[PDB]
Write a structure and sequence with these properties.
The PDB classes it as hydrolase/hydrolase inhibitor. The structure holds 3 protein chains of 3 kinds. By secondary structure, chain B is mostly helical. In chain B, about 20% of the residues lie in helices and about 0% in strands. Chain B has one helix spanning about 25-30. Classes of the chains: A mainly beta, B mainly alpha, C little secondary structure. Bound molecules: ligand NA9.
Chain lengths: ~250, ~35, ~10
């Protein structure tokens, strides 16, 4: 997170950390959607250009954290993966289209004041909130500047941007399963996700029932918090059906 | 519903009627805010 | 990063 601020305790009870066993290091961000399933970006697990191809036993899932490096005894919960599912049509070759993956935990995690699942949007909710100008929130333990890292979970509120503006800001072919967010060059305010925040949740609080819904997943960007450039996120509702399939089928 | 009842309600905030330091920034933008 | 307990390394 660039130009954000320290999150307050229990502010993102669904924030998950993808931790690599060896070497022990932050891999990606992720989110808890139920007591047995975590959602993240597919490029966190598979991305050939960088020789990345992790499997169930290469990593751990850490839920309920605040501090980036400390083992938060009695607060955080470390879980093991039983199965990883990458969207069958994930296009890592061209534009990172369909950058999504689901992870099944070995055992259900118990909720607490720091561990709680976020909601998945439904057609009605996505349509009401997914509008240009409406702000969302991104959280992560990633880099603070493009060129080091935070001690505590960082957070930023960012406005969703009109599809047109998103297209004309890059040479990469944008698709319907993506959306971008960030402040424009002349808006005075700034901020963005960055390396390390990948797979992290972009959420919005419904003004109708007071619940938090995950609308996107930190996917890609060109640099971090660069004027004229924007962050791109996986459109969670668009892939909602593949999510339901996977879950009630396995 | 489209998420196990209870999802999205944070133990330390919504369930106690407390708000975090910047959540109103979001809500103010769901109409015409900036 | 602070080392995490061993009974997790699986
Ligand atoms: C796997 C991703 C990646 O690094 N994601 C991490 C990442 C970086 C920056 C941002 C941001 N909102 N500013 N979000 C996520 N890649 C390779 C990229 O985003 C490419 C951009 C394209 C690579 C080819 C496929 C389309 C994206 N740029 C790297 C960089 O700028 O640091």
């Amino acid at each position: 997170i660039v130009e954000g601020s320290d999150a307050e305790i229990g502010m993102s009870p669904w924030q998950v950390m993808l931790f690599r066993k060896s070497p022990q290091e932050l891999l990606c961000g992720a989110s808890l959607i139920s007591d047995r399933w975590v959602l993240t970006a597919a490029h966190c697990l598979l991305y050939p250009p960088w020789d990345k191809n992790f499997t169930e036993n290469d990593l751990l899932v850490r839920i309920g954290k605040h501090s980036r490096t400390r083992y938060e005894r009695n607060i955080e919960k470390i879980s093991m993966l039983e199965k990883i599912y990458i969207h069958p049509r994930y296009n890592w070759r061209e534009n990172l289209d369909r950058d999504i993956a689901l992870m099944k935990l070995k055992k259900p995690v118990a909720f607490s004041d720091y561990i709680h699942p976020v909601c998945l949007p439904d057609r009605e909710t996505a349509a009401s909130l997914l509008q240009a100008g409406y702000k969302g929130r991104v959280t992560g333990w990633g880099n603070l500047k493009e060129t080091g890292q935070p001690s505590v979970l960082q957070v930023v509120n960012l406005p969703i941007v009109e599809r047109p503006v998103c297209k004309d800001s890059t040479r990469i072919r944008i698709t319907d399963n993506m959306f971008c967010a960030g402040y424009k060059p002349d808006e005075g305010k700034r901020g963005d996700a960055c390396e390390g925040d990948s797979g992290g949740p972009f959420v919005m609080k419904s003004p109708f029932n007071n619940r938090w819904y995950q609308m996107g997943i930190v996917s890609w960007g060109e640099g971090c918090d660069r004027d004229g450039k924007y962050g791109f996120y996986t459109h969670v509702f668009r892939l909602k059906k593949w999510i339901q399939k996977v879950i009630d089928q396995f | 519903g489209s998420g196990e009842a209870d999802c999205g309600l944070r133990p330390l905030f919504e369930k106690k009627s407390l708000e975090d330091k910047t959540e109103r920034e979001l809500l103010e933008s769901y109409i015409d805010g900036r | 990063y602070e080392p995490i307990p061993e009974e997790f390394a699986q």
